[PDB]
Each structure stands twice: as structure tokens, then as C-alpha cells.
Design a protein that fits this description.
The complex is a heterodimer of chains A (129) and B (127). Chain A contains 5 helices and 3 strands; from the N terminus they run βββααααα. By secondary structure, chain A is an alpha+beta fold. Chain B is built from 4 helices and 3 strands, in the order E-E-E-H-H-H-H. Classes of the chains: A alpha+beta (129), B alpha+beta (127). Bound molecules: chloride ion (CL) (3 copies) and sodium ion (2 copies). The site of one chloride ion (CL) has 4 residues of chain B, from strand 1. The site of one chloride ion has 4 residues of chain A, from loops. Chain B: It is found in: Cell membrane; Endosome; Cytoplasm.
Chain lengths: 129, 127
């Protein structure tokens, strides 16, 4: 029944380049059978969370899905933007995990416990990987 | 101290005339000590929001102030255009007000809690 999630450690990938982006470490510790691993650590970027939230909104129960932190850049500093984003991503996952139809989602499990890309998850869930 | 802002009740002013326009009720309630009124209700039109943002962005320097909804009528109907505008205007104010960055801006206060026109605000703050 314990599922503890943390979002930490923003890092810049491909820094300086056309395709630079920030990603976040996601730690999960759980004794839940929802998950193949008791402990996992993966990195995900904001756009993958956007993909995730939309996938969760296809849930079979039509249950509402917690909000993500937004795209607003209205911050004195980039550090503040990233920290508020990090907090908001962690809060999002905490709340997702409290909803049984969302917690049990097979694509959530692939998001949290693998580093399959979004297209790779999409291929996996069609048996095309 | 929280600031609650709502943009509601779009209405057509001067309906059927050359100078017809839509405006919006801006309702604010706050326990923030800086505001002159705990609850205010003013009406503002889109062009006034455009004026406001320009003033706010000058104050912010290179910090990017929240975007306004645009002019392009990409929604299918006037009703949908106005409702999405209203939502966008509320979102703009929510983001503006939820940060400490612009809360000292004289123009913002007069926009929100007076029914001074834009020229009158400009005159007020210029002396
Ligand atoms: Cl971007
Ligand atoms: Cl497969
Ligand atoms: Cl009228
Ligand atoms: Na084990
Ligand atoms: Na209305």
C-alpha cells in the first residue's frame, strides 16, 4: 500500500544545442503489485508528462486527471521556474498515484518504471515494439 | 495573502453602433493589504488589457509577462471566440497577480480597481 514518488535533480541535456532540454529524475519506492519493480529511477522531460496526462485522460472510468504545472515562463529566474515545475511534477504524480484507476494504468507503469520513449511506449502497447 | 480574480459576464456596449465593443467584468477579492479595495468590480475591454500588458512588460524588463489571448478569430463562432477570450483574460490576470513581480505597478492597480480610462490612468501616473 505504500507508493512514494519523488521528482528531483533537473539536468540539462544536449546543453547549448538546437535540441537542448531539461529532464527530471523520478524515484519510485513501492510494495504495490501495480509495479514490476520495488524501486525504480528514470528520467523524464516535461513534454513526456504532457503525453502522460493526455493518456491518463483516456482512462476507462472517465475520472479527472490531476493538473500539470503549466508552461508559464513568468519568473524572475529560470531556477525558480524549474523548481516550481519540479514541485508541480512531483505533486502531479503524488495525486495520480492516489487515484486507483490512474495508479493502475499500464502506460503510467511504463512511464515511471522504464525509459522507453513515448513512441516506444505507443509501439509496446500495440505489440509493435 | 491570496488574490482571487475572475473575468466574467462579457457584454456588448454601444450595441449596433459604429463604436460597439465587448467588455468584461473583472471581479477581485483579496485580503492583501496593498489593495485599496477588498472587493472590486470593474469593466474592461480587450484593448485595455493590450495597453496594460505593454506597461507591465516595460516594468518586467526581460522577464516575460503572461501572454494575452489573441485577435485571430479561429474559433467557429462569436460565442466561442468571446468565451475563450474571457478564459484567456482571466488566466492572464491569475498569472499576473499570483507572482510578486508586478504587484507594485501603479497602472495595474488603477486598471483593476478604478474605472479611470486608459488616458486617465496615463495622466494620473505621469502627473
Ligand atoms: Cl518550448
Ligand atoms: Cl512489442
Ligand atoms: Cl448597449
Ligand atoms: Na524483489
Ligand atoms: Na455571461
Amino acid at each position: 500500500e505504500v507508493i512514494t514518488v519523488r521528482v528531483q535533480d533537473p539536468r540539462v541535456q544536449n546543453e547549448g544545442s538546437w535540441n537542448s532540454y531539461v529532464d527530471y529524475k523520478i524515484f519510485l519506492h513501492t510494495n504495490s503489485k501495480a509495479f514490476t519493480a520495488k524501486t525504480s529511477c528514470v528520467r523524464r522531460r516535461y513534454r513526456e508528462f504532457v503525453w502522460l496526462r493526455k493518456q491518463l485522460q483516456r482512462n476507462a472510468g472517465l475520472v479527472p486527471v490531476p493538473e500539470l504545472p503549466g508552461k508559464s515562463t513568468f519568473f524572475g529566474t529560470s531556477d525558480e521556474f524549474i523548481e516550481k515545475r519540479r514541485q508541480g511534477l512531483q505533486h502531479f504524480l503524488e495525486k495520480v498515484l492516489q487515484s486507483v484507476v490512474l495508479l493502475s494504468d499500464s502506460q503510467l507503469h511504463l512511464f515511471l518504471q522504464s525509459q522507453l520513449s513515448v513512441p516506444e511506449i505507443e509501439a509496446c502497447v500495440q505489440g509493435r515494439l
